[PDB]
Amino acid sequence: TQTNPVPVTYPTDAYIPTYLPDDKVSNLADLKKLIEMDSRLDLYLTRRRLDTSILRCSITIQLRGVDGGKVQYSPNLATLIGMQTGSVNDAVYSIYKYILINNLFVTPELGEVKLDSLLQKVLDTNAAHLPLMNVVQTVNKLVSPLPPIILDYAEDTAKLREITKLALQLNSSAQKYQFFHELSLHPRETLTHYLWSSKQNELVLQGDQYFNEDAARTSDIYSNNNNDRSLMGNISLLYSQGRL
């Protein structure tokens, strides 16, 4: 995956209302218990999913089983490890644990090690300090592959989408409840709010009707519409700014 979450088009777990009276519903607590039950169970599953991985001619035949599960060791590195032909990651871990046993870092101070006899023999170098990066880079060179035979002579997304859609319908029904409840308590200063805001939103929707194709190619904007006053009064300003 990425380093940041993926934006997506459809909603994802919108809220549950809390202002409904519990003397009538008495059920949102139970759905709440089910939701934190799901979150706890999902926490357990995600932790376990993370922790589950935590002339005479010769015969040359390249076999079926040329396989890097058991890779050949150089005999110097075989003497340093001890095993005959084990693996590559086992080799890296064994070399690093040998270095960690012999206390060679420092008693870059932890990058530089103290080169001893066998390790200089298996690396064919003669320094005293050499960083661990190059030491484990040489492991890639010191290992050779195994020799062949030689003879000479989902539905859950849609389900969660449905639960999200249903919770949105719950939000819609709760908002339509709360409107009529607040109108039921004090009706004066919500009907005045309606008569104000409906008028203002009608003016906002009717703020765009003189910008059509054939309403601007004609002449019934510029001439005789001092009733409108909005444009053709900017021309004292727009020429003075050089736009034209």
Binding site: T3, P5, Y19, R47, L50, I54, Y93, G111, M133
Partner: protein
């Protein structure tokens, strides 16, 4: 906003004013995120800390959760070692949530914020490490995530290619923070609950040091403390 986030019957929010209120509460937290460094002595029965720790359980905004975590991180800075709000006001539903954010492998700002909160929470060490490693689920997610967060977004040497033929030289941004937190957690001496964790993580981190050589300079005080 705490009265909204808890659901108390006093001052139930009218929904039609909600867009008037919503951007009202994003501009206040950004003040509380900025001035909290100057409220650096945290008291016991504080109202800011109680209110934000009530808010953090409710919201679903990534931005607002990161702002609450940074505010609670920078509010407990020059704290104490004996008695402030962190010893009691974290009511264990919240602290089980902040450590849970380490499981989210995809995001990376939230992991850094959660590790910084736990790091600023764990600097005293006496009554803090036991409280952190007290729970059967808070002390157990850290056994799985924190060795895995060392090689987070780092090109480890793979072996699937070597099984199917037929080194990074760097770190990440959260690997440094995890190494810092684990070296600070290795300083819990006298064999309390901290080194009991720091001994049970070494056989798994030892495989991570064999892959990434910049984990040798880092994880130094932990390796000296084993």
């Amino acid at each position: 906003f705490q009265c909204v986030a808890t659901g108390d019957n006093k001052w139930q929010l009218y929904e039609g004013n909600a867009t008037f209120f919503n951007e009202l509460t994003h501009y206040t937290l950004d003040l509380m995120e900025a001035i909290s460094s100057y409220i650096a002595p945290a008291m016991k029965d504080d109202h800011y800390f109680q209110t934000l720790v009530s808010i953090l359980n409710y919201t679903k905004d990534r931005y607002m959760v990161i702002s609450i975590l940074r505010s609670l991180s920078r509010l407990l800075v020059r704290s104490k070692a004996n008695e402030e709000s962190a010893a009691d006001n974290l009511d264990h539903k919240t602290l089980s949530l902040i450590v849970s954010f380490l499981l989210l492998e995809c995001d990376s700002e939230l992991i850094i914020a959660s590790l910084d909160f736990l790091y600023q929470y764990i600097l005293p060490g006496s009554q803090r490490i036991t409280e952190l490693f007290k729970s059967k689920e808070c002390s157990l997610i850290l056994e799985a995530t924190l060795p895995n967060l060392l090689s987070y977004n780092i090109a480890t040497p793979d072996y699937h290619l070597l099984q199917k033929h037929k080194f990074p030289q760097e770190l990440s941004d959260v690997s440094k923070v995890a190494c810092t937190f684990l070296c600070l957690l290795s300083n819990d001496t006298d064999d309390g609950a901290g080194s009991a964790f720091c001994q049970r993580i070494r056989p798994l981190v030892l495989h991570k040091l064999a892959d990434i050589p910049p984990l040798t300079l880092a994880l130094s005080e932990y390796m000296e403390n084993t």
